[PDB]
């Protein structure tokens, strides 16, 4: 069961486990509803739940380079430079259908970074 990092972390505390944007956390235990236990490559610890979003199989991960406002009535999303978003689909016209958090919607290839 495993999580995208939308957002960067910093550990207050020992036990928090550090997430920068584009982190893979594997889900220990989802602890409560504010802070939840997993793992990013070897270390563990906490970090906020409400500051991830679960990969589903075959999802890509990738960041923004450049903000994008996108056409509504296309279908088209908005996204700001450095925001995460996913998409398991295959790019149309040069557009790919991403997620990130509650916002679906196209957006051009070139707008997009591997990570």
Do not use: H
């Not at 970090?47 to 056409?71: D, H, S, W, Y």
């Amino acid at each position: 069961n495993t999580y995208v990092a939308l957002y960067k972390f910093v550990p207050q505390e020992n036990e928090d486990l550090e997430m920068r944007p584009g982190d893979i956390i594997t889900l220990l235990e989802d602890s409560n509803e504010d802070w939840w236990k997993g793992k990013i490559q070897d270390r563990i610890g906490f970090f906020p739940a409400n500051f991830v979003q679960r990969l589903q199989q075959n999802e890509k991960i990738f960041r923004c380079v450049r903000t994008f406002i996108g056409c509504k009535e296309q279908g088209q999303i908005t996204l700001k430079e450095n925001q995460i978003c996913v998409s398991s689909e295959e790019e149309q016209d040069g557009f790919i259908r991403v997620l990130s958090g509650k916002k679906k919607g196209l957006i051009p290839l070139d707008v997009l970074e591997n990570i």
